Ligand binder design. Structure first.
Ligand code: ADP
Lengths: 144, 288, 104, 129, 143, 144
């Protein structure tokens, strides 16, 4: 229960929170991080040029948006069938699997932020470049 | 630990038992300590505490209970006894909350200590699914710890098989939640197949008949063989659908009824079902 | 499939090899539906819309059934085409859906 | 009951209506798909039909409605008691999540707040004694 | 506070903000329906209301705290921008009522100027009202 | 919460209750009186011939019944769609709007009971005369 007084009062003491979920763990997704409940409550204070890399916020935003869309599309596949999904939606559906297989999953392994951004850009290539709404063109040209 | 007995005696009963348990493990025996139950032990202790005028807290229980209960469960473990040799005391404690509330005393403090919890589910019982253990609410902390024993002595694919079955059950749970909203009519064949196999896992595997002379105990060798029959039926099911085989055709596949009674077979005639499954699907690849 | 149309047209569908049946009124035509339905072999009956202005009430009456022919009103009379009964069929179909008699 | 009812309750509710919503946008997409195969059917129809009127020439006729009749056959009634299908359906369905949602929150109202006048009364007995 | 505005800034302060709020209120209702039945069935009248509602949101509600000018919007500037938007609304609804294509109004040249009005630090902003009227006339001309 | 112990215990101390509702206020209906939760505990003691007018109870009963039916039909419209509503139900649906627009809403204005009964009869005309179950025929002939 994340509303129990103990965990609930701890949230204010943090700059970054990583929330793990049993439901996600039971789907075999490890690390079992809830991508819609983990926050850089202070993330923006530890990223960018001179800290990580200038494209870090854009890449994080795009991966989060694409993974969330991809997860919703898993629901849509169940509703309509895989074959009735549009070509564009199929790419987002596939991106969610790629995010889980390659970005979330680590074979125990100490990834540098450079390594993590590289995997992020590699999986992002699965999406149409025209569908990268949250990455400014300056970063696409320099990093894609 | 009867009701006419003082709260004192019932309080001491777990300590007398654990000591006797530790005594037998010292000989090099593996002993099981079964504690009917700690809810009643905490009620006997609360009676003694209140009579001693100790300050009541939550549900009027004394503050001292959590450290004590933990100290009890800490005496559990497999050890290298005095003078070498190995022995162990495994503890299985019953949990009886005041009534479904599942809070204090018993449950709350216990579920925080124990590494394993087998949740008998009254709804699973009413549905005649035995053992009535909820495969969604139960947990253990040892899967990786014991996987190598299974891989080396029983089957190389034990861990991968149970992870795959659990992902099946996990997917079923998600699907049933959605169906609860938008109904089952919109379900694709792929999703209907997952529910079909998910159901076979629940009925043919999870459910076990404690009253049957055979299914009362399921040897390790039999457990994996039944798992591979189910998982092999799954792969074949998903493979047939991918080739436009009607799910209705698979749902009434003759081998299915045999897979359903597999828990009652005491001979390996069970792994033969794998080949019986494959040929039957071929007869479905034939008719198209 | 059968086609129910005004007699001249019905004749023309026949000369083309199709199974056209001639009628000149909503009622006559419903009669024709019932004979076809009872008689049994058709999967679809395409009916000039001038002859089938109420095809739900039409099904309603055919019964009892038993497995029905799809029933398909298709547009007529002569001056009924030289409108556009498309613009308004569309007004109704969008209101129908979203709920909103939109200002077309 | 009491606790536990607490959270499965409303995620039946919240997670379960997030995906009733989502069948809603699905079906207005079908909206736009369906209505565009709707008018064009319409098109040739109006069409050489009355090419039929001024009428060998026997097919300006069934040639006509082999084209004419077929096209509007699929499109015309397959195309929507099934179109007007798709979308007429799944919406009394975000009705489910709708008023029935009022449901979960009078339910939830009722007791994390009621269950509390209470953890605190009993405190209150020998909390007060 | 309406009387302070009416006496010191503009006689039509309250009526203007009530009218803009009714616009935003109507947009909210329209967007809820569109969420259901899609935007294809929308009449020109409803498309115009969304067009002007959007201009209110982008040209008025939104303010740039980082811009040297739009960081602060004097009372005198607030009403003048409001009257440019409300005047564009009246003209928009008036043009539609006379069968002017909304697509013709949507690409009206003055619109881009109305969009950058929050960045102007001179009354050149109220001049946009006359610039709006003549431009609509050029749309009343072409019909 | 009208069930909170304070407002709930106050009901017994009253001869007339006027209950205001936020939902109604948010629909722009002012005064935001819930016509199916406002009662005259002692209303019958202050109405009729020699007090207000002989048809007052009948008119009040009919307006209350028609408004309550009309409000339920707003729910039915949401369930089935406006076009699927019967002609008779459509009249009751419309009556609820008329009651709110014309009877509840006052442009600040001191209405005599005669003025209020007149508005009541005017809106009642929207209903089929055959559907005025709560007004005796004597009153229909004399006042309709
Ligand atoms: N049988 C009834 N017919 C009509 N109105 C009634 C009836 N019973 C109650 N009411 C309405 O409810 C008001 C309160 O009723 P009452 O019996 O005094 O409440 P309580 O349940 O609090 O005793 C009455 O004054 C009247 O306006």
């Amino acid at each position: 229960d994340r509303t129990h007084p103990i965990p609930d009062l701890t949230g204010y003491i943090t700059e970054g929170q990583i929330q793990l979920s049993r439901e996600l763990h039971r789907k075999g997704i490890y690390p079992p991080i809830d991508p819609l409940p983990s926050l850089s409550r202070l993330m923006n204070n530890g990223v960018g040029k001179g800290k990580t890399r200038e494209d870090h916020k854009q890449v994080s935003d795009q991966l989060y948006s694409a993974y969330a869309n991809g997860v919703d599309i898993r629901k849509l596949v169940a509703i309509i069938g895989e074959d009735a999904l549009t070509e564009n939606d199929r790419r987002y559906l596939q991106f969610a699997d790629a995010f889980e297989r390659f970005f979330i999953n680590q074979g125990q392994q100490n990834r540098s932020i450079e390594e993590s951004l590289q995997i992020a850009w590699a999986l992002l290539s699965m999406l149409p470049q025209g569908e990268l709404k949250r990455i400014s063109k300056d970063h696409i040209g320099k990093y894609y | 630990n009867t009701s006419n007995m003082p709260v004192a005696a019932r309080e001491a009963s777990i300590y007398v038992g654990v000591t006797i348990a530790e005594y037998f493990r010292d000989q090099g025996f593996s002993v099981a300590l079964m504690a009917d139950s700690t809810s009643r032990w905490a009620e006997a202790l609360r009676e003694i505490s209140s009579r001693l005028e100790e300050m009541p807290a939550e549900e009027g229980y004394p503050p001292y209970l959590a450290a004590r209960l933990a100290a009890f469960y800490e005496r559990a473990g497999k050890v290298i006894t005095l003078g070498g040799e190995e022995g162990a005391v495994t503890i299985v404690g019953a949990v009886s909350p005041p009534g479904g509330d599942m809070s204090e005393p018993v449950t709350q403090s216990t579920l925080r200590i124990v590494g394993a919890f087998w949740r008998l589910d009254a709804s699973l019982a009413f549905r005649r699914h035995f053992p009535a253990i909820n495969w969604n609410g139960s947990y253990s902390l040892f899967t990786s710890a014991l996987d190598p024993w299974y891989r080396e002595n029983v089957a190389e694919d034990y861990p991968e098989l149970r992870d795959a079955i659990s992902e099946l059950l996990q997917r079923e749970a998600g699907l049933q939640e959605i169906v609860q909203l938008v109904g089952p009519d919109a379900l694709q064949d792929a999703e209907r197949l997952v529910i079909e196999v998910g159901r076979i896992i629940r009925e043919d595997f999870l459910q076990q008949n404690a009253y049957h002379e055979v299914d009362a105990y399921c040897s390790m060798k039999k457990a994996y063989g039944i798992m591979k029959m189910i998982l092999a039926f799954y792969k074949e099911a998903e493979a047939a659908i991918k080739r436009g085989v009607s799910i209705d055709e698979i749902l009434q596949l003759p081998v299915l009824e045999r897979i359903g009674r597999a828990r009652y077979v005491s001979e390996e005639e069970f792994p033969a079902y794998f080949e019986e499954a494959m040929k039957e699907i071929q007869g479905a690849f034939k008719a198209l | 499939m059968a086609v129910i149309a005004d007699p001249e047209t019905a004749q023309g569908f026949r000369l083309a090899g199709l199974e056209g049946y001639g009628a000149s009124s909503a009622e006559e035509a419903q009669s024709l539906l019932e004979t076809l339905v009872e008689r049994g072999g058709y999967a679809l009956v395409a009916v000039d819309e001038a002859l089938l202005p109420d095809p739900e009430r039409a099904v309603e009456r055919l019964m009892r059934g038993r497995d029905l022919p799809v029933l398909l009103p298709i547009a007529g009379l002569k001056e009924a085409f030289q409108g556009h009964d498309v613009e308004g069929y569309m007004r109704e179909l969008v209101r129908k859906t979203i709920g909103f008699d939109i200002k077309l | 009951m009491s606790q536990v009812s607490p959270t499965r309750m409303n995620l039946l509710q919240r997670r379960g209506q997030l995906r009733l919503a989502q069948k809603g946008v699905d079906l207005l997409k079908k909206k736009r798909d369906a209505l565009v195969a709707e008018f064009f059917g319409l098109v040739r129809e109006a069409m050489e039909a009355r090419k039929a009127l001024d009428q060998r020439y026997a097919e300006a006729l069934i040639r006509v409605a082999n084209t004419e009749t077929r096209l509007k056959k699929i499109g015309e009634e397959i195309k929507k008691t099934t179109r007007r299908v798709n979308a007429l359906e799944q919406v009394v369905i975000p009705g489910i999540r709708a008023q029935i949602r009022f449901i979960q929150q009078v339910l939830e109202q009722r007791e994390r707040e009621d269950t509390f006048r209470l953890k605190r009364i009993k405190g209150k007995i020998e909390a007060r004694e």
